[PDB]
Design a protein around this ligand. Structure first.
Ligand code: ANP
Ligand code: ANP
Ligand code: MG
Ligand code: MG
Lengths: 94, 466, 487, 37, 469
């Protein structure tokens, strides 16, 4: 963990999250899961699947963000705590 | 006994008393100043020398300047004549309406009621405000976290509560502005005057104001919550009332604490707060509960650091809360007032064994219908609100009637709203929503429930608007 | 005489430890053999920790330290207007000496809660973003905050420029005297900073305090107050002053240095425990005084430099709370084209419409609720390859209004000139025009109204709002000017 | 927040990939065309 | 006056004087050493004892050893005779070319030029680097900051700025080595000797050298910056003449001090730096500037710990610059050099009323399309290059080209790229980007713009590219 990195993945996954939710609606209005998958290996459906896919994808990102942020703060608190103990050890060493 | 200042390092002052040494927490009076400069004892350094935290600037102080031991801790004026008045940290009136002529005085430092003095009964403090009383009841003698920044109905919900509790419970109220901004502190004063809660003429004032401005030192800003606390205690232990204590920004109390702590050179704990965090929060918070004589319920506005609920400050504060009133701009926009979120605001006491099975199942039904309607939003917009089964069309409708019935016109809004405020008894609210849930009032238009009082005014408002 | 004078025991890092001075007061000035000044922050049994104003190379062990009695004071009054000075009122522009006709203590108690009255009179910045979405009232403490090179300063410079309008005017109740306090900047920048204000003939009514990166720590620490004072003279005399503290962040940095060098107790980020008490007492000093005290005001604009935007950091936190609102600036919005780079969603004045004439109140709100609705569909933007008419329409207004907000630096406009441009936007006239042209429009559009429709602007101001007539006068002015624009 | 995705890994190599791949063929696609002209 | 050493802990030595106590900033000569050892008075501990930081190693000092107060601060040789000579931190010559017979010595410590002394003139300084002159133009006699994490191109870039601007400079130029690699000192010296900017047989030498690299204890690195600055000071005042001041990594001025803070008895501040970090840097930077007496065109290389620009050291250094060129690992990694960030490099003169409207618009036009492209980086990160409307995918295709056209081969970086360094005139740069933003070269492959000079070579290379296919 590193505040710099977490902050990077959060932003990046918050972005992804936004784009996927947008795609779920477009689909709704109209990657499509295992649709093209099935027929090759062997609309209504196509959009169905795309709706579903982005949906889950949207949740899966939010559940991921929700977990990164906790790690964000835990780690945010830790850094402050670290910086402080360092600051005092030097003072108590004078 | 007289001491002599021998050390001044910012808001910290060490005084040497040759003979009688002043105990810890004892207020000392600095001699030779225009205004009054109080030094609260904090430590006995040894060598007849004591350390202290000033309650106001320390510029001008000189080593050797005389200092007087007031014999006890910081004492302030207590009793009826404090209501309507704005009190300083040390008890001084700052509303310039002259002296605070009281016959009584008390110390801001008082141990919390003992175990025997404890109430074992879980009673609900009726506010008369539907959402509150129905979805997140205020535990009588309990702390409630007021969530919501500004411009969401905070100042209105605060006074209304002052009004209701006064009208339906006879108890007064105190407002401890911890780390208040002189600007909003002023705004609040007049906003209250023009609301009725404060009267600069006839003793009809229902609230006592106590302020701890930001320009005031960490020492000052740390004790205010107690000064205002001591004030409220009088009305509970002396007049057996069920007071209401408002601490706007309990956070700035905490922070006030850390700054004192640091100034005193103590080693910070995790996240830079004071080691004493929990005890600083303990000693004060615990002076707020139901006693055999009466009870004090307190609404404390809370600031979550970095939006992190786990940060020490709040997390140390959530240990003392029984409820949370969450204000929401999302709600305020829809025109729903109070903008209390019906799903984020909650209560510990919202249990059958406490609010009765009946009251419970109602609050629960309303929480679940809103939850159901809040989901549907997607489908309704996208998949179109045309393929909604019978069970799907009623939810959305009923939920909307509920959602709006959650709005209530405050008596303190009369001044501007031009509408008689309403104070709904717990009985009326339960049945009101209890029915809506049944479907008894499905043959009525939405606006019928918007901005009303008891369920009656819903139907009466319906016919008129046809 | 260890009573009125003292001897230096040690001297290191602007912290001279002095023996004697048993009679100095906490926060009192003192002089060293070499004639330098020194504040007295720490009063100890065995010693006096004295903070040094200026290089310490001049102070040696033994050096005598006599009291001055004369607490820290700074010259105040109009004679400072147009003059650039250091943290201690000393002139530093070589234009000669100032007419110090009156002085005032830098360390003074701020006005109480009763000498005040709400914030009503606008504090026109001249910035379309601020005055329409983040209105400032006289007596208000608004914070400019954002990363480095994000334009924080450029919000203060224009806002000062903007003051000429009213300054060269006859309406003396709208006049606003400015005070730009530079903390920890380099002489270089200040000098450019001043020429600008001067080439714009604004310095004539502006005061500049400069505790540059070379001035000693305590000098940088004082300037904010010494400056706040200069503004209080006007605040106490019915006049209104706008003071800008360029980055309190730097001031804090100086305070800490002294704190840690004296060995006080360090806390979060090594800052002393009363760092908050440092800014709180300075920021409260601003106020909209009551008609009884003259009606004067001291409006404050401190600047906070965040790191990577972390506002949950110690000092940013501090100030954020202490002040009345925030105008958030950001790099992304910048290189994007959104200049000034203000985040309408994150920036906020708690005073809102209070200091926003009805002329502005109308157009604003609608825009607000619209920039807001646009702020939801935003994402759908580029991926909306089938968006319904509704959102597609929410996006449209979206881009139109932002271009409007694009304003030129050093180029602020009168509240009326403003509403006149917001008007053409909110009413939907720019909804057809191509995005990249909007700008060129406001440009040709504003010059025009100002050129051939002065009285129309006046009527907006006068009528307090958008009259039924003026709303009619504009609808035709725009329709026609518009149509000719796309010919 | 503008381009956080790319400022990382997993999905960045992808964006990086598709990206280059595209402009890779495209350009070759444009390459011989240059000859034509 | 003579003093005795009473405590030696690292670079921090305590000397007790019985006679007179030397003022702070005074240089002290340690007697009994086969190499001049200077001790700078840092503090007055009290009881006739001063604490000092050693300008060299303390290996061998003895408690009680004599110390002669030289009467004043570190004074070094200044003037034309330094030109071509490699100087120490205390003025000692380290080129083995004998003594530096100077007729004047200045104290490396002095007050910063007053405010009334400041100059407000700003004339764009053309560098031939498209990105620089395009987005964040340097200015004549201004303060240039070059930020960069480890090995992204600070040293190579500053080298190009000497091969471009210094070689064709009608005047003197100072270069100070501040806690870097001694090997780089070798390189720069012998490379200046080749180009003839330095003459060992006569007096045509136009650059003065000052060094206190890594192998040096903090104390030295903590002052060399001030040493080199003094040498360039003399060239700015006692002549008025134009002076160019190159300091390779001023960051070693703040680390130096960060490596002796504690031992000077100082509670540490945020991130371990000294509490005096910002003010030390202040009484140091303010001195490196153009006054009404003469002008200094400074180019400082600034390190950025772990690549974090928010780090106190660098974050405090920005405001001291009138133009910043930020390097980006991310960019360097995409094989783009100089690895200059287009979205984080700024300049004070980037105003339309100083460079004209044409120059300005294109610059912001570049920056914008590049910011839009960052916004699509995400969208296409999940979708692929086949969803963007023909309008967006069009900008993506221009971003790439504009991105690549910002890269440029350096004469100084031949040994690296293997190509022939090019030098672009300003006007050819604007045209260059003006046309690409126009859509003109949408028929040319991106690669055509990668590592070239004026926009022409692009088409030319693009052609050499068509024929090869
Ligand atoms: N409205 C504007 N339009 C165009 N450029 C602008 C505008 N406002 C500011 N700028 C420019 O943006 C640059 C930096 O903004 P500036 O006023 O220096 O911000 P800052 O936050 O004070 N930076 P600093 O304090 O040096 O870290 C300058 O080159 C200004 O000319
Ligand atoms: N213009 C360039 N063209 C090609 N490669 C370059 C260029 N600039 C830097 N590099 C590469 O990066 C390496 C070293 O970069 P350099 O200029 O020394 O970085 P630096 O910023 O001074 N690093 P450091 O001082 O160690 O933190 C070189 O050896 C090259 O491989
Ligand atoms: Mg600035
Ligand atoms: Mg290097």
């Amino acid at each position: 963990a590193t505040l710099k990195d977490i902050t990077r993945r959060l932003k990046s996954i918050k972005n992804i999250q936004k784009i996927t939710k947008s795609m779920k609606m477009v689909a709704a209005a109209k990657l499509c899961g295992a649709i093209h998958s099935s027929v090759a290996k062997q609309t209504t459906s196509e959009q169905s699947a795309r709706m579903t896919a982005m949906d889950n994808a949207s949740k899966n990102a939010s559940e991921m963000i929700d977990k990164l942020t906790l790690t964000f703060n835990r780690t945010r608190q830790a850094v402050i705590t670290k910086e402080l103990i360092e600051i005092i050890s030097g003072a108590a060493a004078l | 006994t007289t001491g002599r200042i021998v050390a001044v390092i910012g808001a910290v002052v060490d005084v040497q008393f040759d003979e009688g040494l002043p105990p810890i927490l004892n207020a000392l009076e600095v001699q030779g100043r225009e205004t009054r400069l109080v030094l609260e004892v904090a430590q006995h350094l040894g060598e007849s020398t004591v350390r202290t935290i000033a309650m106001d600037g320390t510029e001008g102080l000189v080593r050797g300047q005389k200092v007087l031991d007031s014999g006890a801790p910081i004492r302030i004026p207590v009793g009826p004549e404090t209501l309507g008045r704005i009190m300083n940290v040390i008890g001084e009136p700052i509303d310039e309406r002259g002296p605070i002529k009281t016959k009584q005085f008390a110390a801001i430092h008082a141990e919390a009621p003992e175990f025997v003095e404890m109430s074992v009964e879980q009673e609900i403090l009726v506010t008369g405000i539907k959402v509150v009383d129905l979805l997140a009841p205020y535990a009588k003698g309990g702390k409630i976290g007021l969530f919501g920044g500004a411009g969401v109905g905070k100042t209105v919900l605060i006074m209304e509560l002052i009004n209701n509790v006064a009208k339906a419970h006879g108890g007064y109220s105190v407002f401890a502005g911890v780390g208040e901004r002189t600007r909003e502190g002023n705004d609040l004063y007049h906003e209250m005057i023009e609301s009725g809660v404060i009267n600069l003429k006839d003793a009809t004032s229902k609230v006592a104001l106590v302020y701890g401005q930001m320009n005031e030192p960490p020492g000052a800003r740390a004790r205010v919550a107690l000064t205002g606390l001591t004030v409220a205690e009088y009305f509970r232990d002396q007049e057996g009332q069920d007071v209401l204590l408002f601490i706007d920004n309990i956070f700035r109390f905490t922070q006030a604490g850390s700054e004192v702590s640091a100034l005193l050179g103590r080693i910070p704990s995790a996240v830079g707060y004071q080691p004493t965090l929990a005890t600083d929060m303990g000693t004060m918070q615990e002076r707020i509960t139901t006693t055999k004589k009466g009870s004090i319920t307190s609404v404390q506005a809370i600031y979550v650091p970095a939006d992190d609920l786990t940060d020490p400050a709040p997390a140390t504060t959530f240990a003392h809360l029984d409820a949370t009133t969450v204000l929401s701009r999302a709600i305020a926009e829809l025109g729903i007032y109070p903008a209390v979120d019906p799903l984020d605001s909650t209560s510990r006491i919202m249990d059958p064994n406490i609010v009765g099975s009946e009251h419970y199942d109602v609050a629960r039904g309303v929480q679940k219908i809103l939850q159901d309607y809040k989901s549907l939003q997607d489908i309704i917009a996208i998949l179109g609100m045309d393929e909604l089964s019978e069970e799907d069309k009623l939810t959305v409708s009923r939920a909307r009637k509920i959602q709006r019935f959650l709005s209530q016109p405050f008596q303190v809004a009369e001044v501007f709203t031009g509408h008689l405020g309403k104070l709904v008894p717990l009985k009326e609210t339960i049945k009101g929503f209890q029915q809506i849930l049944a479907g008894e009032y499905d043959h009525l238009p939405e606006q019928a429930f918007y901005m009303v009082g008891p369920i009656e005014e819903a139907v009466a408002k319906a016919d008129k608007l046809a | 005489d260890l009573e009125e004078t003292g001897r230096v025991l040690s001297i290191g890092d602007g912290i001279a430890r002095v023996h004697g001075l048993r009679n100095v007061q906490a926060e009192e000035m003192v002089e060293f053999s070499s004639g330098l000044k020194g504040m007295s922050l720490n009063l100890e049994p065995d010693n006096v920790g004295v903070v040094v104003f200026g290089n310490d190379k001049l102070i040696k062990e033994g050096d005598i330290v006599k009291r001055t009695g004369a607490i820290v004071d700074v010259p105040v009054g109009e004679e400072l207007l147009g003059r650039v000075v250091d943290a201690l009122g000393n002139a530093i522009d070589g234009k000669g000496p100032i007419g110090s006709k009156a002085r005032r203590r830098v360390g003074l108690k701020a006005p109480g809660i009763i000498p005040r009255i709400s914030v009503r009179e606008p504090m026109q910045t001249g910035i379309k973003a601020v005055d329409s979405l983040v209105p400032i009232g006289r007596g208000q403490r608004e914070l400019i905050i954002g990363d480095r090179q994000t334009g924080k300063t450029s919000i203060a410079i224009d806002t000062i420029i903007n003051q000429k309008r009213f300054n060269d005017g006859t309406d003396e109740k709208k006049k606003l005297y400015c005070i730009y306090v530079a903390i920890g900047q380099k002489r270089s920048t200040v000098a450019q900073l001043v020429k600008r204000l001067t080439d714009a003939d604004a310095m004539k009514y502006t005061i500049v305090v400069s505790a540059t990166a070379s001035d000693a720590a305590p000098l940088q620490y004082l300037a904010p107050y010494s400056g706040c004072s200069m503004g209080e003279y006007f605040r106490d005399n019915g006049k209104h002053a706008l003071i800008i503290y360029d980055d309190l962040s730097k001031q804090a940095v100086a305070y800490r240095q002294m704190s840690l060098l004296l060995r006080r107790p360090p806390g979060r980020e090594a800052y002393p425990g009363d760092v908050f008490y440092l800014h709180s007492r300075l920021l409260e000093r601003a106020a909209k005084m009551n008609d009884a005290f003259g009606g004067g005001s001291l409006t404050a604009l401190p600047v906070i430099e965040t790191q990577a935007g972390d506002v949950s950091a110690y000092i940013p936190t501090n100030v954020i709370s202490i002040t009345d609102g925030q105008i958030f600036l950001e790099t992304e919005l910048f290189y994007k084209g959104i200049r000034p780079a203000i985040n309408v969603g994150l920036s906020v004045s708690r005073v809102g419409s209070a200091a926003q004439t009805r002329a502005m109140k109308q157009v604003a709100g609608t825009m607000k609720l619209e920039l807001a609705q646009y702020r939801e569909v935003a994402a759908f933007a580029q991926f909306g390859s089938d968006l319904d008419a509704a959102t597609q329409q929410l996006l449209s207004r979206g881009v139109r209004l932002t271009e409007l907000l694009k304003q030129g630096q050093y180029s602020p406009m009168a509240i009326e000139e403003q509403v006149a441009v917001i008007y053409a936007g909110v009413r939907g006239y720019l909804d057809k025009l191509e995005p990249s042209k909007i700008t060129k429009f406001e440009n040709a559009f504003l010059s025009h109204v100002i050129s051939q429709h002065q009285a129309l602007l006046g009527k907006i101001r006068t009528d307090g709002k958008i009259s039924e007539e003026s709303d009619a006068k504009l609808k035709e002015i725009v329709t026609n000017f518009l149509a000719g624009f796309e010919a | 927040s503008g381009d956080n995705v790319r400022s990382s890994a997993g999905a960045v190599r992808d964006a990086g990939g598709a990206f280059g791949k595209r402009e890779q063929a495209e350009e070759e696609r444009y390459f011989r065309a240059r000859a034509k002209e």
